[PDB]
Write a protein that binds this DNA or RNA. Sequence first.
DNA 1: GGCCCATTCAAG
DNA 2: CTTGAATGGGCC
Length: 55
Amino acid sequence: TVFSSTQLCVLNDRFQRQKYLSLQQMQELSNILNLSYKQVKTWFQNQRMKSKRWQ
DNA sequence: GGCCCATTCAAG
DNA sequence: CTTGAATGGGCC
């Protein structure tokens, strides 16, 4: 799978301002991006890991 | 259930 | 080789 440049945008923007998202927030964010909840939740998790790594 | 973590695996 | 989406197990 691969995400659009359009998607990585709102995703990264949201992530920068909010590192933990609720169920509803993830689900709506997924809806307006025509993505599944799973891949968005997964993305966020992976991003949290990425954020951790930088040391 | 979600999160954490190590690990996997399909393209650049 | 790196990248990052995706997996499974362990924990609350």
